[PDB]
Write a protein that binds this ligand. Sequence first.
Ligand SMILES: [Cl-]
Ligand SMILES: [Cl-]
Ligand SMILES: [Cl-]
Ligand SMILES: [Cl-]
Ligand SMILES: [Cl-]
Ligand SMILES: [Cl-]
Ligand SMILES: [Cl-]
Ligand code: NA
Length: 129
Amino acid sequence: KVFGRCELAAAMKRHGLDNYRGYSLGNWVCAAKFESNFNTQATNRNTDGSTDYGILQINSRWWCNDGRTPGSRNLCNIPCSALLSSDITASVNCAKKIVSDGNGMNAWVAWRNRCKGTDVQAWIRGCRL
Ligand SMILES: [Cl-]
Ligand SMILES: [Cl-]
Ligand SMILES: [Cl-]
Ligand SMILES: [Cl-]
Ligand SMILES: [Cl-]
Ligand SMILES: [Cl-]
Ligand SMILES: [Cl-]
Ligand code: NA
């Protein structure tokens, strides 16, 4: 599913991400825009043989099982395919574990490089929330 900006903001708010670990909703919308262009089906292979899945590009080296990342962990206890669902629940629940891990949203390279320190409230401007 390719979400609209406001549609995704509303879905993320309903799933409890607004101000989760102190990160305002615009941070999460900005991260999804630049990680996946709001496409739940986004996948990208990494040099190390891991793969990033879904709207927040969660990596199979640590967070999910794809059966083809040797020596990896599955800290969200989910198949990586669950992260490509039209239903963002599994992505949101795993993202909550990631952002609790110690480096906050710096775990998302696109957030650090394209959202951090910017006017992220712009990403929820106009939306009925
Ligand atoms: Cl947009
Ligand atoms: Cl915000
Ligand atoms: Cl594996
Ligand atoms: Cl594990
Ligand atoms: Cl699995
Ligand atoms: Cl959803
Ligand atoms: Cl933090
Ligand atoms: Na894994």
